[PDB]
Structure formats: C-alpha cells, structure tokens
Scaffold this active site. Structure first.
Site, PDB file in Angstrom:
ATOM      1  N   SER A 171       0.216  -0.713   0.744  1.00  7.96           N
ATOM      2  CA  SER A 171       0.612   0.086   0.007  1.00  7.96           C
ATOM      3  C   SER A 171       0.429   0.772   0.288  1.00  7.96           C
ATOM      4  CB  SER A 171      -0.715  -0.264   1.297  1.00  7.96           C
ATOM      5  OG  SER A 171      -1.825   0.930   0.679  1.00  7.96           O
ATOM      6  N   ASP A 217      -9.164  -4.909  -5.455  1.00  7.54           N
ATOM      7  CA  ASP A 217      -8.552  -3.675  -4.501  1.00  7.54           C
ATOM      8  C   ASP A 217      -8.703  -2.610  -5.334  1.00  7.54           C
ATOM      9  OD1 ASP A 217      -7.264  -2.685  -2.427  1.00  7.54           O
ATOM     10  OD2 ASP A 217      -5.018  -2.610  -3.548  1.00  7.54           O
ATOM     11  N   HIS A 236      -6.803  -6.498  -1.808  1.00 11.13           N
ATOM     12  CA  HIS A 236      -5.496  -5.474  -0.766  1.00 11.13           C
ATOM     13  C   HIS A 236      -3.865  -5.980  -0.310  1.00 11.13           C
ATOM     14  CE1 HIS A 236      -4.044  -1.254  -0.840  1.00 11.13           C
ATOM     15  NE2 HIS A 236      -4.016  -1.183   1.130  1.00 11.13           N
TER      16      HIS A 236
END
Ligand SMILES: *[C@@H]1O[C@H](CO)[C@@H](O[C@@H]2O[C@H](CO)[C@@H](O)[C@H](O)[C@H]2NC(C)=O)[C@H](O)[C@H]1NC(C)=O
Ligand SMILES: *[C@@H]1O[C@H](CO)[C@@H](O[C@@H]2O[C@H](CO)[C@@H](O)[C@H](O)[C@H]2NC(C)=O)[C@H](O)[C@H]1NC(C)=O
Lengths: 411, 411
Positions: free
Chosen positions: B150, B333, B390
């Site tokens: 991320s 995601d 994610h």
C-alpha cells in the site's frame, strides 16, 4: 393437478417436503414430450405465482436450476443426498422447471428428431404451457412469470411474445439471469471486460483500440480490419481456452487447467443423482429413455440460431405496458457479462429512467451489505449481483432470493 | 543476535516455534525507536534471505502483516489463539516486520514528536536497517529484500535508493504489494476500474468521457473541466463512501453499510491480542507505552506526502541492473488497483519485454489453476493475483507464497 405425476418419496431426502411436487410430461408441438418438475410454493401455493424456469445451452437441463441453483433442495457432492435450500424460489412461488427443447434431459419426441430453432422452441414451449394449464387448471388464474438463464435470454422473450397473445394466461412479467440478449453487445462488452479485469495487457489492448475502434466507438462484433480480427482471436484464446472459468472469473476451473459437459464445470453430483433408477421411478421417467445428461451435445450440435437481438421482442412486450421485466447479471460471469445486458436494457431507450443505485441485503451476521447495482426504467429494470457468476442463485443464494422476492412483489 | 530480545513463550501458541524469533527496538534517526519483530526462516535461517516487511497507511503497523497476512502464525477471531500459517513467508525467509515510522504500534521517540515525511521515513528506516545488522551481524551477508504493501509503494523504493549506496547491505531486490507508485496512474485507473466493474452507469460514464477525456486519452487526476470535477466526485462517493469494501470489492464491509481504523475492516482480533499485558511482556514492550492500534490516526494526520511518483526511484534502481523488482496487485482491490501499477511498470519503458501470460498454482485438490497474470521486463515484473484484494496473502495465501518463493529464487 395430475395425481399420477405427484412425487411421493424422493430418494435422498431425510424429511418429506411440506409442499406437493410433480414430475411428468408436457405436450410440446408435434410429437415432443417435455419433462417437467413442478414444486408448489412452501407458503400459500393456491395464490403464489406460477414461475416457469428455463436453463439455456441450447440443450442444457432446467433440472440444473432445481438441483444446483434455486430449487427447494440441492444435490450434495456424494450425488445421493439432497439438502433443503433455505433460499429456494419455491419458498414464495409455484416453480415449473421444464427440460426444453425435446431430447434435453428426460424430454423426448416419438419421431426422435431433435433438430430445432428459436421459433420452434418458442411455439413448443408455448404449447407445453397450454398443456400445463390443462393438467393444473387450478393454477390458470395465478400470476404467471417466465424466467430463465443464459440462452433463455432468447427462449424467454420469444416465448413471452407468444404468451402475451393468449388471454387465458395471466402473464405479469419475465426475468432473465445472465442472458444472451444481443450477440453484438455481449461480444463488444466482453472485450472491455477482459482488459479491465486484467486478462489482456496494453500490448493487445492498445492494438484493439487502433484497429477495431474510431470516433470513441469500438466494433469487436463484426469488425473486419485484419489486425482487429487477429487481436480478437487472442482475446478468445485468453478468455475461453486458457483455463479461466468463463462462468465465474474468480472461481477455479473444475478439473484444473488443460495443458455435452460445459468447460470448467463438474456436473457429476446431479448426473449421479438423476441417473439412479429409483430417482427415475420417483420422477415417473419412462425406463426406455436414455441416460440423463446436463447438456445434450446433439441438440446443441443440430440447433439453428435465428435471432441475433431480442430488441424487437422486448419493445413488443414493453409497448403493451402490462408486464414487469428484470434482466439480472452476476458481474463476474464472462459467458453473458453484466455490461452487455446493461448496454442492451439502456439501448431500449425506455422512459421513467430512475437513477442507478446500490441495492442492499441484510446478511444474518455481517448486517446490511451492497448486493449489487440496480437501474429502473418504466416496466424494465437492469440489476447486477456483486461477486456472482453465471449461476447467480448458486453463488449468491440470499441475494438471488431477495432479488426474486422483490421482483415478484413489484417493489 | 540480541539474546535479550528473543521471544521464549508467546501467549496463545499450543506448540513452540521450530524457529528463533525476536522483538525489540531498532534505532531510527534522532530519538526514534522502531519496534521490530524478526522471525527466522523455518528452513536453514543461516543462509535464507533477510526480508524487510512494511505495511502502509501511512501510520499502519507491520504487525498486521505478521498476524493477519503472511506471518508464521495468525491471530484467530477470539483475539487469544494464534494458529500456525502453512503459507508463512518465514517458511523460506528471515522476515523483519518493522513498525514504522515512530509512534506506529509500539514504535516511539523520546521527544514524542511523530510528524514526519517520505524523505525522513526513508532515512530513519535506513538507520534502523543499519541498527538491525549491528544487532544481527550474522545476517549482514545474507541476501536482503525490501518488501511492503500500500503506502510502502513509496516507503520501499525511497528506502531502496538509500540502501543501494551502502555496500555493507546485500540488496538483491524489492517487492511491493498493491502499492501506491503514482497518484495520477492510480486515480485514472480507478475510474475505469469503477465503470468496468459495474459501480457506475452509462449516464456518469458517458459524461466523464465527454468532459474529462479527448484524443482517446482521459484525465481523472488533475482535470479541471467543471463537469469533470463534478462527475469524479460522484465516483468517489460510490467507490469510497457508499458501503463497498475499498480493499476487496467482492468482500462484505465489516460492520455493514453506513446509513485510526480503516473503513470496512475489523482490527479487533489483532488489537485484542497485542494489547494483552503478557503478550506485551513476551514481545519486550516497555510498560509505559500507550495502547497498540493497527493505524495511528495522528501519524497519518500529521504526515506530509512529498513524492507523487516513484518513476525516478525505480529508474535509479533499474539503471544499476543489480536488483530484481516485483510489483504485485490483488486484482479486486480498489485502494491501489492492479491496472494503475501495471500502467506504472509499463510507463518505465524497460527492455526484455516478455509477453503477458497467466501464471499457475497447484491447489492440493482442484489441481493447476490460473493464479493471475505476469509481465516480465529486464529486472522488473508486474503480476496480478486473481480474486485477491489489498491484503494479497490474507485472501490468496498459497498464491502469495508461490509468488514470493519464485521471486526469491529469481525464477
Ligand atoms: C466432481 O464432483 C464429484 C462428485 O461431487 C467429485 O467426486 C467426489 O469426490 C469426493 C472427494 O473425495 C468424494 O468424497 C466423493 O465421494 C466423490 N463423489 C462421487 C459421487 O464420486 C469429483 O472429485 C469432482 N471432480 C472434480 C475434478 O472437481
Ligand atoms: C470483529 O471481530 C471481532 C473479533 O473477531 C468479533 O467479535 C467476536 O464475535 C464472535 C461471534 O460471536 C465471538 O465468538 C467472539 O468471541 C468475538 N470476539 C471477541 C474478542 O469479542 C466481532 O463480532 C467483529 N465485528 C464485526 C462487525 O465484524
């Protein structure tokens, strides 16, 4: 009801149904005998709607719908046990699963000639419906709904146009699950779906844009640029012959990646159950009939497709303003992807355009959840089921049931 | 190794690890103390690579990685039991989970000043790495890999550029999971992702095409057309504030649809476990330190973002030709969608372009399955994980482990 068609003791059930169910034959056109399996509403059958269900193919059995999608009980992997379905569409409806056309599953004809086309399947299905109401005259007045999946995107609107002319039939609507509505719109939508779901790279995408597209509009359907026809062939290899499950992109391919029976799908449980001699006896199937297959390769092989678009069928049905229409798509299916059917419903250019919004389901634990997106026009809605593939009720049974309940209740 | 940092008896484990594990503090810049948790390879630690892991935020704890993604054991919903992870990245690697920057989880500073930026986090992370190799001098010579998820899309390439100048560190590569590489490419890719995943209709799509786009190219990043800035705001409401799980489109929103803690995510199990006094003692956490949170709102609140693109960091790292780079994205995601990072890797315009193909995993039962798509350039690969969100190792642990193993083995 025909008392001799009633199923009394269905093998593999530990409790007996709270509802009456029938298995026998509806007379289609000519010498066609279409095997039906009718399951009355678990609640107030006398007044619950009558709901035709057709699976597609062509040549695939509506009994797949019963035993693996939204029937009152579902076959287990042993191919022996049936378990009650808490999301059965027969909770609130009298559901007619019809093996159609002739030669599919337990359906047959005396002349044993199984070559057919869209107009003949409509006419035969229409005559079987008339036969149903002669055997079940107590259901003539109940609300009738025509529903089905995949190629039933053609079966249902063609059948519906025949039914809307018989005033003895109380037609209120139709619902099509992951339906073939327009080859062009399917084929064009699928190519976009492939790229934006990460199946094609920029090499192949950039090339399709250049050779298949112009003035912001793309033709992946009937396009003739050499490079276009070349790019689209790699797209079909990737989508259809690389080991992806075409029915559910995020599901595994049953049997693993290759180095009638649909690709990446395992029909063993249903086949094992329906080929049991005692199951055939309980279901009143003539001993002479050949083995039950999910999809008849030969019906498929000899079938002749006539319509390329259902635009005129839908506008005929919509012009009456008597019927509520639902097209619902699992949004991870690639055989009849949601976008193709959303484009289709939009291109009908109907009135009362009511803004695209999420629709909700309460899951017992997880609480209110987005179940997908809905777009309501006058007398026709388009709806996605988020994370469902080609068989919506199999993947998302509570969302499938909630959608169905709201569609029936016209709310 | 620092013997006083070794964890001896970790609460909630029924069997004692086959491997040595440490919890203590690495000295960052100034007065920063970064809490580490080091788990040696289950197989031949002496020679297994050393692998830094960073979670993002900014202000989110790398211990989320350990306890819920790819650590040797994973917290159960009771927030008490740990269960061994058969897909732990520590099966083949010495894995360093680092709470970074200061104030995140159990990390702190004496001056207790937690306002920071990309350049300072890199420099501090670089100094903590130097501190690690002073405490673990027996690991100085092992292959070093810099990895994270991320916002670590910024943390890792900025840290990597500092590490490639210290010849005492045996840098071999970096891997970024669902990483922020380019705001522009993320933001632009997300709008397409929204439409082609059925979250926006043709009304809003047709409008974005008209007011945000031209000559086949769209600007959804910094575009200034009034209608464009208006359309993009409905897109953010739909994607981000309608009740969709932004981390996994096909997953439910934890806590249900609304009529630091990330939206639609439940951090209770990890929080319950790490806030247990005996867990803190076992992990050698000073009693004075405040409660453990997954994400520090305040670090997030006072953080100042400096870079908008990692293009120059990556081209610096690639120009050496010494390091193997992997950017891997779960393809469902929406926080850092796969397409944005695929565009990014492509726009680096590297050599040895090796054709986009499916990559396979053998699942024990279901056999060989497509696990996603891979695109290999010279020294950098882009890879999707099909049906992962994610947190790739949480959703698809066997695919995550297979990818990791192949990345380490440079095969
Ligand atoms: C297809 O489905 C069949 C039937 O569900 C599977 O066969 C079963 O395998 C399980 C696992 O050992 C057994 O417990 C059952 O007894 C089997 N059922 C029957 C009737 O044989 C089969 O493995 C599936 N094949 C694939 C490739 O998915
Ligand atoms: C968030 O996670 C917590 C912890 O996993 C959930 O709390 C648990 O709920 C289950 C279901 O009854 C209980 O069996 C556990 O004992 C609970 N754990 C604790 C430590 O209380 C909680 O329900 C989850 N909340 C949401 C909205 O998803």
């Amino acid at each position: 009801a025909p008392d001799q068609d009633e199923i009394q003791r269905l093998p593999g059930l530990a409790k007996q149904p709270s509802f009456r169910q029938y298995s026998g034959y509806l007379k289609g056109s000519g010498s066609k005998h279409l095997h039906y399996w009718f399951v009355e509403s678990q609640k107030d059958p006398e007044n619950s709607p009558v709901v035709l269900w057709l699976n597609g193919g062509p040549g695939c059995s509506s009994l797949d719908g019963l035993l693996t999608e939204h029937g009152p009980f579902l076959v287990q992997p042993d191919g022996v046990t049936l378990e009650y379905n808490p999301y059965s569409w027969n909770l609130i409806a009298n559901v007619l699963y019809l093996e159609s056309p002739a030669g599919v599953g337990f359906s047959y004809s005396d002349d044993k000639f199984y070559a057919t086309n869209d107009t003949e399947v409509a006419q035969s299905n229409f005559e079987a419906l008339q036969d149903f109401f002669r055997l079940f005259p107590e259901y003539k007045n109940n609300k009738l709904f025509l529903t089905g999946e995949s190629y039933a995107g053609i079966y249902i609107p063609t059948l519906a146009v025949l039914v809307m002319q018989d005033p003895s039939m109380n037609l209120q609507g139709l619902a099509v699950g992951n339906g073939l509505s327009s080859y062009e719109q399917n084929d064009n939508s699928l190519v976009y779906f492939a790229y934006y779901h990460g199946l094609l790279g920029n090499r192949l995408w950039s090339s399709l844009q250049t050779h298949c597209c112009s003035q912001n509009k793309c033709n992946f359907y009937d396009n003739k640029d050499l490079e276009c026809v070349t790019n689209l062939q790699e797209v079909a290899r990737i989508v259809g012959n690389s080991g992806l499950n075409i029915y559910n992109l995020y599901a595994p391919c049953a049997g693993g990646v290759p180095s009638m029976d649909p690709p990446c799908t395992n029909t063993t449980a249903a086949s094992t159950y329906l080929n049991n001699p005692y199951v055939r006896k309980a279901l009143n199937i003539p001993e002479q009939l050949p083995q039950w297959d999910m999809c008849n390769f030969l019906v498929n092989l000899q079938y002749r497709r006539l319509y390329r678009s259902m635009n005129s069928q839908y506008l005929k049905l919509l012009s009456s303003q008597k019927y509520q229409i639902l097209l619902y798509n699992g949004d991870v299916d690639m055989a009849c992807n949601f976008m193709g059917d959303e484009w289709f419903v939009d291109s009908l250019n109907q009135k009362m355009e009511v803004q695209r919004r999420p629709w909700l389901v309460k899951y017992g634990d997880s609480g209110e959840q987005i179940a997908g997106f809905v777009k309501e026009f006058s007398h026709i809605a388009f709806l996605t089921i988020k994370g469902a593939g080609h068989m919506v009720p199999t993947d998302k049974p509570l969302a499938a049931f909630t959608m169905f309940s709201r569609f029936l209740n016209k709310q």
